[PDB]
Design a protein around this ligand. Structure first.
Ligand code: CLA
Ligand code: CLA
Ligand code: CLA
Ligand code: CLA
Ligand code: CLA
Ligand code: CLA
Ligand code: CLA
Ligand code: CLA
Ligand SMILES: CC1=C(/C=C/C(C)=C/C=C/C(C)=C\C=C\C=C(C)\C=C\C=C(C)\C=C\C2=C(C)CCCC2(C)C)C(C)(C)CCC1
Ligand SMILES: CC1=C(C/C=C(\C)CCC[C@H](C)CCC[C@H](C)CCCC(C)C)C(=O)c2ccccc2C1=O
Ligand code: SF4
Ligand code: SF4
Lengths: 82, 80, 137, 152, 731, 26, 72, 63
């Protein structure tokens, strides 16, 4: 009934489902976020920061009192033939 | 895409064409057999490689041979 | 032969399905098929079930090409109906395939060109050979 | 042959006694004169008999107390393999020769496969006994026991 | 454009198929784009240096951890009552009872008990300290580097060799025999007489004193003079303590035979003598073929001249030289075949003739090593039989091989295959027949009706070796013969002592149970060979598919036409044989392990009676030794065998997962994914994200592989978990 | 010491898997 | 009874599928119930596909959890 | 009129034929020189495709 070689888009599911909403905005509080979230918006630079943020994992394990790394002590079993 | 070939050992029974669901083959005027026809493979781009054509061939061993080569969406038979 | 071309035609009655086009159509390709019915009949429709055929030009859009032929080969049987389908593309364009020659591929026609015909006969193929090609040229 | 014959065996002899005591344990709950009674006692005599026979015929019996067969070809123990083996090949050939003789007779004329699924031809004219003398197929070998179509 | 760059046809695949196949074809150089014979040869040659680099790095790490986290020194001082340490354990997931149970071998933390036998090997050759182990690790790390340096060097144009250089076979044999085999064996005999033997006796001969310490009291003279018996006058005393200068002779070359009584290992003096002996044959042998000096042979001509007149081999081996040298698949299949054979020869001779000190008493290590190499030998054999077909399809020139021994195999292929079928059918019908029969009577409670064929032929071989068991009166155990007296003391008295040892594995006692299993293994060999050669001889084509030659080694199939053509490629025939190979080695390793764990417990009586019927195997071997294993972790406690209990279940899971890829096939999965592709598209908050590769079901051949990989991994890991734990638990 | 390295043996998969992903989609 | 009951249910799947191949004719015997079902068939399977993955994880996974926590 | 009789038995020489070294009866033999493969042949045994006949080239032996 409605196929138009002119517009190939409506013909296909090209249309954004009504879930799209191109409406206004949100409060001015954004002016704050835009200021402090800027260094993480660069990409690639952020890729690196997070990977080198893996330096946290090293720091957290080099220093860790309560993970089972001690026997605590025992007298070991010989044991099948010593 | 897939590579299909026809051989002069054909007898022009046209069953390979009727078997194809994508329309990869067709009949051709020729002087080699009594039917004076021969299979042709012009549209290999639409070939999916299912070998339905081979299972209709009556020649002692196939006159039409499908050689599965590079894969494409059409050959992969994808609808998405 | 001159391709007839398709402009606008009504679609057959159906009501919807989940086997229709999806994204591929938008960005790669989609195939449409046209056939004329002497009666508002009922046909199976692949990728779904039950659709009324309609009477008139009848235009349907599908994907994979094969879906169109399946319908077309069922359309030629059961009902004595002629049909034709094309590949739409995403930016207009007019590629018309099948019948093409205007006479069915199974029926021998006068000027087609062989394309990939080997006059050697099978079993007489060679063995490689590190050079380009496989020997079934 | 570290084995010492089933006669001077203490294990194989012990094994006999062990088996019959267990059988005897079972008849105690049925009361003689009853059915399950003989069946148990009939089983016991067969047990004694087979143990008795094995010691007679030789049979070496290992340390485990069970007879071990010797197939080296040793004349002392031919009955353990060669003589039954000769008997097998005889019947094995006989079957082979009769079966071959059948498919050959069928091939000329008729619908050959008809005779294969249905054989309302029994031993054909009289094909079975032909196997009584199969070994004479050695003489079929010097002529045409094999077809010359493929290789030699 | 994309990965794989070496395959443009693969790189343009819109689906997920490209990533998979890009990985599975990376080493198949001949199929790469614009491949040349030049590019082919020095890709392999460079890949060769890469493999060496890995081996040396891998061996460097072994020397490193044992020196860093392994006691070794504690092990040296009491090789009998201490457990070797592979490396330390560090796992955050470990609970306190775990860290507890795994703290062993006098280590400050949880470690793994090494079952590779590296301790016995390193100790026997003369490594006594951790410092020694480090220097080896550094040296191997350095050896690992110069391998990469050479790999990089010959990829450079000013150092790259010509293909012809690679095809000069006459000179590569002359060097590999004379140098690679001969000299390296000779050099090892030097380490033995300078370090291993004196290190064994008690002196520490190292780099800072090896120059000033005579390997023998008498000078190097006696060798050069001609009188070499002086190297065997004073051998080590029978009651000698290893690493102790007690009852230690002076001789550096002997033929004593038998075992060093304390260590239960072969004499070092015998080995220093062995390698020296074999070095020569290799050294002289590496001077057979012609190079640049005007003397030597031509391999081609020898192959040409070997034509038996009046048939029946035809042209003999003419043109066969060029068929092999121009085809590196033939060479590899020929290499794997030889390597695969001696790989088992290693396994068979290393449990019968322990080479290292205190390895014979480490029962878990002995079982592991044998089982290790038999599976390694197994897979290698399937590869030799795999590159075979590939040779036929890709490199075989029928005309250039007209009517020679190779071409005569294809023209009577139906004969070889059918008789392999017969031999397989024969063995299977009776071996299984004899087994089932035996189970019947034991069920019926009459084990005296069994068919227990005494392996009298093999027992005749044992008596022929020196075993005085049985009444056979054969060579080396008879009343009058040239054979035993040819002993002339030397090897015989020390060796005949070793054969009649009721403790060692040197020629165990065999019976009816050993008869049935040997036929089972014979069944396993024949059937596996039947599958593999049939794939090879029909690789170029059969009657169901005469042009299989035109499709390559690996293709999915040829369709459902002509009755159906599933698994018709030579690749699939390999893939089917891998199953049979695993079964065969499975029977071999079952048989080896059970007979030994019954011997080690001093109860061979249980094996001799339970091995004659199949219920015995499943119960007294499988069921019986699983108890300690499956209680590695209990709803009450947690043992050191918890790793193996978990891996045991792990192996089961991988194994059963392969079954999915082997039974269920593609068309079901592809249609399933197509519904999932529709879903993702029609789901809000997920529409924003799209895939860059089209989701598709795995290929027909890919699934057979993926399924076989799962099947094989679980196969190994399950038995590995059982072989170690069941043996380690009891010791 | 040995409690610093098995995690970089797990930082490495994160790095390797990320890099390879970029390589294969390019 | 569990096996007999199990087998018969599987047999229902067969003949239901046989009906679709051999006896389903919309021209003569339309139902409409059958339609739609065929119409949103890619939906039903896709959802049922998900439930199995959810169930499989939240069933077998718990055991693999317990097997791992007890071993450690 | 060409090489093979109408009732003569003939051995196949194709190598790719199901009946590669077998024998078969000939139906007839077309005489058009244009025809690459005449010499139709009947066989007692069918191939993997249930066909009993096939046309062959002039090169074959008789018997
Ligand atoms: C594995 C190879 C092999 C083969 C093919 C044979 C074959 C044979 N053996 Mg020998 N045997 C073998 C190994 C073998 N044996 C070994 C290793 C031993 C040592 C235990 C023997 C001990 C042995 C004895 C004591 C005898 C044979 C005999 C025989 C013959 C019995 C058949 C017959 O007499 O006519 C039907 C047959 C030729 C018998 C013979 O010599 O014929 C009279 C016989 O007396 N064999
Ligand atoms: C000297 C040893 C050697 C060498 C140099 C080669 C070399 C070659 N082989 Mg060969 N092969 C060998 C031994 C060898 N093989 C042996 C011993 C066997 C018996 C199994 C085979 C069986 C074999 C087959 C069936 C094929 C080859 C093929 C090839 C060619 C391409 C391989 C490729 O890149 O695909 C890529 C390889 C991979 C991507 C390997 C990854 C998959 C495996 C399963 C990984 C290991 C298992 C798993 C990951 C373990 C993880 C468990 C975990 C839980 C711990 C190449 C010439 C192929 C060929 O010739 O092309 C026609 C071919 O199809 N080989
Ligand atoms: C889910 C539970 C779980 C997890 C996450 C782990 C994790 C680990 N275990 Mg524990 N373990 C467990 C359960 C678990 N285990 C249980 C139930 C037991 C029995 C009680 C044990 C007993 C145990 C022992 C005895 C040991 C460990 C060790 C280890 C560590 C391995 C060291 C390493 O990473 O090197 C590198 C990682 C590998 C080599 C894995 C590679 C295998 C992959 C799959 C194949 C190769 C991939 C291929 C190259 C593809 C490339 C892709 C890639 C580049 C992205 C690791 C932290 C070891 C350790 O502490 O380290 C010092 C150790 O010795 N475990
Ligand atoms: C003296 C001269 C010499 C020497 C020493 C070598 C040595 C070598 N060559 Mg070279 N080559 C030479 C001359 C020489 N070649 C000449 C003149 C040419 C042609 C003009 C070539 C052309 C050539 C090519 C094309 C290649 C080589 C390769 C190799 C390496 C083989 C792979 C390997 O390491 O395993 C060595 C094996 C051993 C040392 C032992 C032999 C195997 C036995 C059966 C093992 C059992 C021993 C013992 C019982 C077990 C002990 C185990 C215990 C220690 C744990 C090896 C380093 C290959 C390579 O690049 O390396 C990866 C290869 O691609 N060579
Ligand atoms: C083809 C089948 C076959 C195969 C592959 C094997 C393979 C093997 N056998 Mg078995 N063997 C067989 C049949 C076979 N045997 C038969 C039918 C018997 C008599 C029951 C034996 C009795 C036997 C004994 C006592 C021993 C072996 C042993 C062995 C191993 C060492 C090699 C050897 O001596 O055997 C030699 C095989 C032959 C000499 C026969 C070759 C195959 C012939 C052609 C089968 C047909 C012969 C026919 C039945 C003779 C008629 C008998 C009579 C009427 C004349 C090896 C695994 C030894 C072993 O290691 O034990 C663990 C061992 O001591 N075999
Ligand atoms: C034991 C082997 C095995 C396993 C694990 C599965 C698993 C599955 N099958 Mg399969 N199947 C098998 C054998 C197996 N099958 C065999 C032998 C056959 C022949 C009949 C089939 C036939 C079959 C059919 C016809 C279908 C399935 C389907 C499914 C899936 C159902 C959905 C699900 O539960 O997801 C959850 C996954 C699991 C429960 C597996 C374990 C998950 C682990 C414990 C958690 C992840 C571990 C960890 C995070 C990994 C990270 C480690 C890192 C180093 C990689 C599931 C993947 C169906 C399907 O496609 O989905 C609906 C389906 O249609 N199977
Ligand atoms: C449904 C439950 C189930 C399933 C599916 C399995 C499956 C498996 N088990 Mg397991 N097992 C189970 C329960 C189960 N088991 C239970 C409850 C226990 C109690 C402990 C065990 C104890 C166990 C052990 C100790 C072992 C397995 C192994 C295996 C794997 C062997 C793979 C194979 O096919 O090789 C081939 C099959 C065989 C070799 C058959 C062996 C069994 C026969 C009776 C032994 C006789 C061999 C004989 C010499 C050959 C006969 C000759 C012939 C001519 C007649 C397979 C994964 C083994 C493994 O890791 O794989 C090698 C392993 O060793 N299981
Ligand atoms: C190639 C053989 C090899 C193998 C299989 C292993 C395996 C292992 N190493 Mg060792 N390592 C090796 C060589 C090897 N290493 C070499 C040549 C060195 C330098 C001499 C080291 C130095 C080293 C240290 C300091 C540590 C390990 C550790 C480990 C364990 C954790 C994995 C890890 O991330 O460490 C990899 C560490 C590296 C420095 C990788 C470099 C190795 C090559 C050059 C890459 C694991 C068992 C950790 C451990 O002991 O667990 C408790 C740990 O503390 N390794
Ligand atoms: C003596 C003896 C022995 C040995 C044996 C042997 C070792 C032998 C052999 C053998 C051989 C090595 C043989 C061979 C051969 C061959 C051939 C070549 C064949 C053939 C055949 C045929 C042809 C048949 C036919 C037929 C008949 C006649 C019957 C029926 C069937 C048919 C019909 C199938 C032992 C000691 C073991 C035991 C004791 C005794
Ligand atoms: C489950 C299944 C699928 C579906 C399998 C798929 C879609 C594979 C995808 C696996 C996902 C991506 C997880 C696998 C993770 C692996 C551990 C991969 C690790 C990464 C590298 C080591 C390669 C098939 O396509 C198939 C085809 C033919 C016969 C049987 C089957 C079959 O059984
Ligand atoms: S394989 Fe399929 S698509 Fe290709 S020619 Fe044959 S029938 Fe047509
Ligand atoms: S099936 Fe064979 S003979 Fe028939 S038209 Fe096709 S190619 Fe020609």
């Amino acid at each position: 009934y409605f196929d138009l070689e002119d517009i190939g888009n409506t013909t296909g599911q090209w249309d954004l489902y009504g879930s799209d909403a191109p409406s206004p905005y949100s409060p001015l509080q954004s002016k704050f976020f835009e200021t402090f979230a800027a260094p993480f918006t660069k990409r690639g630079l952020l890729l690196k920061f997070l990977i080198l943020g893996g330096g946290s994992t090293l720091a957290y394990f080099s220093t860790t009192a309560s993970g089972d790394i001690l026997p605590i002590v025992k007298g070991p079993q010989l044991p099948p033939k010593l | 895409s897939h590579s299909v070939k026809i051989y002069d050992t054909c007898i022009g029974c046209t069953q390979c064409v009727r078997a194809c669901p994508t329309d990869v083959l067709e009949m051709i005027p020729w002087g080699g057999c009594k039917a004076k026809q021969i299979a042709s493979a012009p549209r290999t781009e639409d070939c999916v490689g299912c070998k339905r054509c081979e299972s209709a061939c009556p020649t002692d061993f196939l006159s039409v041979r499908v050689y599965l080569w590079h894969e494409t969406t059409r050959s992969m038979g994808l609808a998405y | 032969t001159p391709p007839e071309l398709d402009p606008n035609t009504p679609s057959p009655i159906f009501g919807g399905s989940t086997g229709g086009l999806l994204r591929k159509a938008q960005v790669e390709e989609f195939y449409v098929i046209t056939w004329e019915s002497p009666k508002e009949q009922i046909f199976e429709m692949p990728t779904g079930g039950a659709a009324i055929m309609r009477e008139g030009p009848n235009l349907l859009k599908l994907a994979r090409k094969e879906q169109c032929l399946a319908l077309g080969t069922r359309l030629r049987s059961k009902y004595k109906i002629k049909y034709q389908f094309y590949r739409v593309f995403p930016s207009g364009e007019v590629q018309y395939l099948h019948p093409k020659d205007g006479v069915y591929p199974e029926k021998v026609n006068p000027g087609r060109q062989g394309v990939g015909v080997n006059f050697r006969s099978i079993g007489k193929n060679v063995s490689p050979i590190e050079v380009k090609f496989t020997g079934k040229q | 042959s570290g084995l010492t014959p089933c006669k001077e065996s203490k294990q194989f002899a012990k094994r006999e006694k062990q088996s019959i005591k267990k059988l005897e344990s079972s008849l105690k709950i049925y009361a003689a004169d009853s059915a399950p009674a003989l069946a148990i006692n009939a089983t016991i005599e067969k047990t004694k008999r087979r143990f008795d026979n094995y010691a007679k015929q030789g049979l070496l019996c290992g340390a485990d107390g069970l007879p071990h067969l010797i197939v080296s070809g040793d004349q002392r123990h031919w009955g353990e393999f060669i003589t039954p083996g000769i008997l097998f090949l005889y019947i094995a050939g006989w079957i082979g020769w009769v079966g071959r003789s059948y498919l050959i007779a069928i091939r000329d004329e008729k619908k050959p496969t008809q005779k294969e699924i249905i054989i309302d031809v029994p031993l054909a004219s009289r094909l079975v006994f032909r196997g009584f003398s199969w070994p004479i197929a050695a003489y079929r070998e010097l002529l045409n026991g094999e077809l010359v179509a493929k290789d030699v | 454009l994309r990965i794989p760059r070496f395959s443009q046809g693969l790189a343009q695949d819109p689906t997920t198929r490209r990533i998979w196949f890009g990985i599975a074809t990376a080493h198949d150089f001949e199929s790469h784009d614009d491949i040349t014979e030049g590019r082919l040869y020095q890709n392999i040659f460079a890949s060769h240096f890469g493999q060496l680099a890995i081996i040396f790095l891998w061996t460097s790490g072994n020397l490193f951890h044992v020196a860093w986290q392994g006691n070794f020194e504690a092990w040296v001082q009491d090789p009998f009552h201490v457990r070797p340490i592979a490396h330390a354990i560090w796992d955050p997931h470990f609970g306190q009872p775990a860290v507890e149970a795994f703290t062993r071998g006098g280590a400050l933390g949880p470690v793994n008990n090494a079952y590779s036998g590296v301790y016995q090997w390193w100790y026997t050759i003369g490594l006594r300290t951790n410092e020694d182990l480090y220097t080896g690790a550094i040296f191997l790390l350095f050896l690992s580097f110069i391998s990469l340096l050479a790999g990089w060097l010959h990829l450079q144009p000013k150092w790259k060799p010509s293909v012809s250089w690679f095809k000069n076979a006459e000179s590569r044999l002359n060097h590999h025999l004379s140098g690679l085999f001969g000299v390296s064996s000779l050099a090892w005999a030097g380490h033995l007489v300078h370090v291993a033997i004196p290190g064994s006796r008690g002196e520490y001969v190292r780099w800072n004193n090896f120059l000033d310490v005579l390997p023998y009291p008498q000078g190097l003279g006696p060798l050069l003079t001609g009188q070499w018996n002086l190297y065997a006058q004073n051998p080590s005393s029978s009651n000698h303590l290893f690493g102790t200068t007690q009852g230690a002779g002076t001789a550096i070359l002997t033929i004593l035979g038998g075992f060093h009584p304390q260590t239960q290992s072969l004499w070092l003096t015998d080995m220093a003598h062995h390698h020296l002996a074999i070095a020569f044959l290799f050294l002289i042998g590496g001077l057979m073929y012609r190079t640049n000096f005007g003397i030597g042979h031509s391999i081609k001509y020898i192959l040409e001249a070997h034509i038996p007149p009046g048939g029946r081999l035809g042209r003999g081996h003419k043109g066969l030289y060029d068929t092999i040298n121009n085809s590196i698949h033939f060479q590899l299949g020929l290499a794997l075949a030889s390597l695969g054979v001696i790989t088992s020869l290693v396994a068979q001779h290393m449990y019968s003739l322990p080479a290292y000190a205190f390895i014979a008493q480490d029962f878990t290590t002995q079982a592991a090593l044998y089982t290790h190499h038999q599976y390694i030998a197994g897979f290698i054999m399937t590869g030799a039989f795999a590159h075979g077909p590939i040779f036929f399809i890709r490199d075989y020139n029928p005309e250039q091989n007209a009517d020679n021994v190779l071409a005569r195999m294809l023209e009577h292929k139906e004969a070889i295959i059918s008789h392999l079928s017969w031999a397989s059918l024969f063995l299977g019908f009776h071996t299984l027949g004899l087994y089932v029969h035996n189970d019947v009577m034991l069920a019926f409670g009459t084990p005296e009706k069994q068919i227990l064929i005494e392996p009298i032929f093999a027992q005749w071989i044992q008596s022929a070796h020196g075993k005085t068991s049985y009444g056979f009166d054969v060579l080396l155990s008879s009343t009058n013969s040239p054979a035993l007296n040819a002993g002339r003391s030397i090897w015989l008295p020390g060796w005949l002592n070793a054969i009649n040892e009721n403790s060692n594995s040197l020629f165990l006692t065999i019976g009816p149970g050993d008869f049935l299993v040997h036929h089972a293994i014979a069944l396993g060999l024949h059937t596996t060979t039947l599958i593999l050669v049939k794939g090879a001889l029909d690789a170029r084509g059969s009657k169901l598919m005469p042009d299989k030659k035109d499709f390559g080694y690996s293709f999915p199939c040829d369709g459902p036409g002509r009755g159906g053509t599933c698994d018709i490629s030579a690749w699939d025939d390999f893939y089917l044989a891998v199953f049979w190979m695993l079964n065969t080695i499975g029977w071999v390793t079952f048989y080896w392990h059970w007979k030994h764990i019954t011997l080690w417990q001093g109860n061979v009586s249980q094996f001799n009676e339970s091995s004659t019927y199949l219920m015995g195997w499943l119960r007294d071997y499988l069921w019986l030794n699983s108890s300690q294993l499956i209680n590695g972790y209990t709803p009450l406690v947690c043992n050191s065998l918890s790793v193996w209990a978990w891996m045991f279940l792990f192996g089961h899971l991988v194994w059963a997962t392969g079954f999915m890829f082997l039974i269920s096939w593609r068309g079901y999965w592809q249609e399933l994914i197509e519904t999932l592709a529709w879903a993702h598209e029609r789901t809000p908050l997920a529409n924003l994200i799209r895939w860059r590769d089209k989701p598709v079901a795995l290929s027909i051949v890919q699934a057979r592989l993926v399924g076989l990989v799962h099947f094989s991994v679980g196969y190994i890991f399950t038995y590995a978990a059982f072989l170690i734990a069941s043996t380690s638990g009891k010791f | 010491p040995s409690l610093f390295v098995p995690l970089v043996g797990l930082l490495f998969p994160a790095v390797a898997m990320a890099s390879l992903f970029l390589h294969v989609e390019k | 009874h569990m096996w007999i009951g199990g087998f018969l249910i599987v047999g229902a799947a067969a003949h239901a599928a046989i009906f679709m191949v051999r006896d389903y004719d919309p021209t003569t015997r339309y139902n409409d119930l059958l339609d739609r079902v065929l119409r949103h068939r890619d939906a039903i399977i896709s959802h049922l596909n998900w439930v199995c993955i959810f169930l499989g994880f939240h069933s077998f996974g718990l055991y693999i959890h317990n097997d791992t926590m007890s071993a450690l | 009129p060409i090489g093979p009789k109408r009732g003569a038995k003939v051995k196949i020489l194709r190598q790719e034929s199901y009946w590669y070294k077998g024998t078969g009866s000939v139906v007839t033999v077309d005489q058009d020189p244009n025809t690459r493969y005449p010499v139709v042949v009947r066989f007692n045994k069918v191939n993997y495709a249930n066909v009993s006949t096939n046309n062959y080239a002039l090169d074959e032996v008789e018997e």
